Design a protein around this motif. Sequence first.
Motif, PDB file in Angstrom:
ATOM      1  N   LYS A   1       0.868  -1.202   0.000  1.00  0.00           N
ATOM      2  CA  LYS A   1       0.000   0.000   0.000  1.00  0.00           C
ATOM      3  C   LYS A   1       0.880   1.218   0.000  1.00  0.00           C
ATOM      4  N   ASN A   2       1.850   1.150   0.908  1.00  0.00           N
ATOM      5  CA  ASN A   2       2.771   2.239   1.189  1.00  0.00           C
ATOM      6  C   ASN A   2       3.764   2.360   0.035  1.00  0.00           C
ATOM      7  N   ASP A   3       3.548   1.616  -1.059  1.00  0.00           N
ATOM      8  CA  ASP A   3       4.268   1.806  -2.287  1.00  0.00           C
ATOM      9  C   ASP A   3       3.442   1.932  -3.554  1.00  0.00           C
ATOM     10  N   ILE A   4       2.119   2.031  -3.646  1.00  0.00           N
ATOM     11  CA  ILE A   4       1.532   2.879  -4.688  1.00  0.00           C
ATOM     12  C   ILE A   4       0.939   4.088  -3.975  1.00  0.00           C
ATOM     13  N   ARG A   5       0.536   3.896  -2.711  1.00  0.00           N
ATOM     14  CA  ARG A   5       0.509   4.976  -1.737  1.00  0.00           C
ATOM     15  C   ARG A   5       1.957   5.172  -1.274  1.00  0.00           C
ATOM     16  N   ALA A   6       2.945   4.820  -2.126  1.00  0.00           N
ATOM     17  CA  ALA A   6       4.078   5.636  -2.562  1.00  0.00           C
ATOM     18  C   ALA A   6       4.318   5.560  -4.081  1.00  0.00           C
ATOM     19  N   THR A   7       4.994   4.546  -4.671  1.00  0.00           N
ATOM     20  CA  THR A   7       5.499   4.514  -6.051  1.00  0.00           C
ATOM     21  C   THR A   7       4.802   5.222  -7.205  1.00  0.00           C
ATOM     22  N   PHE A   8       3.488   5.295  -7.403  1.00  0.00           N
ATOM     23  CA  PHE A   8       2.966   5.964  -8.591  1.00  0.00           C
ATOM     24  C   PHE A   8       3.192   7.468  -8.698  1.00  0.00           C
ATOM     25  N   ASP A   9       3.198   8.077  -7.510  1.00  0.00           N
ATOM     26  CA  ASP A   9       3.685   9.438  -7.306  1.00  0.00           C
ATOM     27  C   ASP A   9       5.178   9.562  -7.633  1.00  0.00           C
ATOM     28  N   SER A  10       5.840   8.435  -7.859  1.00  0.00           N
ATOM     29  CA  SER A  10       7.226   8.392  -8.284  1.00  0.00           C
ATOM     30  C   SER A  10       7.447   7.526  -9.532  1.00  0.00           C
ATOM     31  N   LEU A  11       6.409   7.096 -10.291  1.00  0.00           N
ATOM     32  CA  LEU A  11       6.548   6.130 -11.392  1.00  0.00           C
ATOM     33  C   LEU A  11       5.574   6.250 -12.570  1.00  0.00           C
ATOM     34  N   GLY A  12       4.273   5.968 -12.390  1.00  0.00           N
ATOM     35  CA  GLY A  12       3.220   6.224 -13.370  1.00  0.00           C
ATOM     36  C   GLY A  12       2.270   7.291 -12.821  1.00  0.00           C
TER      37      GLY A  12
ATOM     38  N   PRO B   1      18.309   7.342  -4.178  1.00  0.00           N
ATOM     39  CA  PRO B   1      17.363   8.282  -3.587  1.00  0.00           C
ATOM     40  C   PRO B   1      15.876   7.962  -3.539  1.00  0.00           C
ATOM     41  N   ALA B   2      15.305   8.153  -2.344  1.00  0.00           N
ATOM     42  CA  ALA B   2      13.910   8.567  -2.268  1.00  0.00           C
ATOM     43  C   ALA B   2      13.781   9.925  -2.966  1.00  0.00           C
ATOM     44  N   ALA B   3      12.864  10.018  -3.921  1.00  0.00           N
ATOM     45  CA  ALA B   3      12.737  11.197  -4.762  1.00  0.00           C
ATOM     46  C   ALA B   3      11.438  11.899  -4.389  1.00  0.00           C
ATOM     47  N   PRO B   4      11.479  13.061  -3.716  1.00  0.00           N
ATOM     48  CA  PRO B   4      10.309  13.770  -3.201  1.00  0.00           C
ATOM     49  C   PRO B   4       9.269  14.181  -4.244  1.00  0.00           C
ATOM     50  N   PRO B   5       8.023  13.697  -4.118  1.00  0.00           N
ATOM     51  CA  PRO B   5       6.911  14.032  -4.996  1.00  0.00           C
ATOM     52  C   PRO B   5       5.749  14.753  -4.300  1.00  0.00           C
ATOM     53  N   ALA B   6       4.499  14.356  -4.573  1.00  0.00           N
ATOM     54  CA  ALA B   6       3.319  14.638  -3.767  1.00  0.00           C
ATOM     55  C   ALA B   6       2.952  16.047  -3.279  1.00  0.00           C
ATOM     56  N   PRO B   7       3.062  17.148  -4.058  1.00  0.00           N
ATOM     57  CA  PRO B   7       2.728  18.505  -3.612  1.00  0.00           C
ATOM     58  C   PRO B   7       1.238  18.559  -3.315  1.00  0.00           C
ATOM     59  N   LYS B   8       0.872  19.028  -2.109  1.00  0.00           N
ATOM     60  CA  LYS B   8      -0.452  18.812  -1.533  1.00  0.00           C
ATOM     61  C   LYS B   8      -1.690  18.845  -2.421  1.00  0.00           C
ATOM     62  N   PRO B   9      -1.932  19.846  -3.306  1.00  0.00           N
ATOM     63  CA  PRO B   9      -2.985  19.803  -4.320  1.00  0.00           C
ATOM     64  C   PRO B   9      -2.663  18.712  -5.339  1.00  0.00           C
ATOM     65  N   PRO B  10      -3.248  17.522  -5.135  1.00  0.00           N
ATOM     66  CA  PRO B  10      -2.792  16.251  -5.692  1.00  0.00           C
ATOM     67  C   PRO B  10      -3.044  16.023  -7.184  1.00  0.00           C
TER      68      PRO B  10
ATOM     69  N   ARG C   1       1.619  14.428 -11.250  1.00  0.00           N
ATOM     70  CA  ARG C   1       1.580  13.830 -12.586  1.00  0.00           C
ATOM     71  C   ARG C   1       2.766  14.297 -13.433  1.00  0.00           C
ATOM     72  N   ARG C   2       3.679  15.021 -12.791  1.00  0.00           N
ATOM     73  CA  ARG C   2       4.891  15.495 -13.442  1.00  0.00           C
ATOM     74  C   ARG C   2       6.079  14.588 -13.140  1.00  0.00           C
TER      75      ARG C   2
END
Lengths: 196, 196, 49
Positions: A76-87, B25-34, B38-39
């Motif tokens: 979970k904690n990896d598309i509720r992480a990874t997609f924000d970092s992948l697709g 690296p963990a690569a920081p994503p997720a800027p609050k207005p979700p 998608r970038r």
Amino acid sequence: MGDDEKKEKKKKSKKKAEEEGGDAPAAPPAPKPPSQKRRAQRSGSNVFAMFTQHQVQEFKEAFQLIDQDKDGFISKNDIRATFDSLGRLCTEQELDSMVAEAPGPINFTMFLTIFGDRIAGTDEEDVIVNAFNLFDEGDGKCKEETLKRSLTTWGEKFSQDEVDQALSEAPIDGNGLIDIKKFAQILTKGAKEEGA
Amino acid sequence: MGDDEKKEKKKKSKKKAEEEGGDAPAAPPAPKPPSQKRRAQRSGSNVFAMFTQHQVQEFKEAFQLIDQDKDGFISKNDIRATFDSLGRLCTEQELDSMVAEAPGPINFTMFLTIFGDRIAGTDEEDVIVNAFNLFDEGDGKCKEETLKRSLTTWGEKFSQDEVDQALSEAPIDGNGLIDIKKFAQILTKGAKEEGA
Amino acid sequence: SSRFGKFIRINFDVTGYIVGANIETYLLEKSRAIRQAKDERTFHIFYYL
């Protein structure tokens, strides 16, 4: 009980689909009744067998730059992480739409069914490509003006705002929107760029 | 709200690379207005066979071979007695350095953290066929006189010693050192043990 | 949130004292168990066991 299978799959199902009705809000989404795992089974779904020799190990062939849990996963904690970092993505609104391809361990034995869920998950070819490929007649396509006439005059009528945005965007390719490809932009055999 | 998704994005680390390698690296994503995240795509995963299908299979699963005491890390005593269980042992110093190709706890992830990242070394076998396969004037062979004269005279030069060693190993037939086989002789599914 | 709601009858003898007393409740959110909406949950106890 078997709700244990379903706690491991309130983790993994949830991998399909509980918060999916995002910007189009709060739909009747995936159900908790166990038989309905096989309505989540809709067309566009291929899943290769366990000791695959490899269409499943091709996911190892990219594994490195994706995973979370490396005894070898994406939780979970990896598309509720990874997609924000992948697709792609998710609002709490669209949360487990996309995060509904992992609310629980994508083990390698689930990478299996995530490139499985790639060629499966969101309404895939038999739905998307055929949405217009069935309005279509043959070795064909659909007419631009007639598709404008649709989008506004047919069904839940849309706005100007909606048409203009989806007009400058529409792959108008010979007086006709290349529908098969407006959908299957998302698919074929020559890219290894996004989603995964 | 629109936030609970983003709370969760931090357990990726808790079992992949980061607990050794903040390096990878963990690569920081997720800027609050979700709408925003998608970038964050990794667009373009292709080169020659990175996971080559008779190699990196084995490496990873030689964690289940090289972890001898079955702890979940790889000790100095793991690499050793597991090489002893095959045959040719490194000295503790050679081992120490080969462990010190990582900062300490070479576990299941640190192992593959250095394994994949190292993409460079020797030339590919098909390049190595091109080595003498581009010298031939037809479909034919390579006249032995030309392979002897070249290795000593041309560009980067060998010693006599360097040629004679290569020459008892060199499959001469019909005054022609049919190059295609010698190339496979040097580098196919090559020898074990030397790393990891 | 709760979902239930109630009633009482109180039968009396010859002299008028409390003798009978009859409580009734009406209806429940009885439905979700086999259909929970996205980001909703079910009846408390399952998750607990």
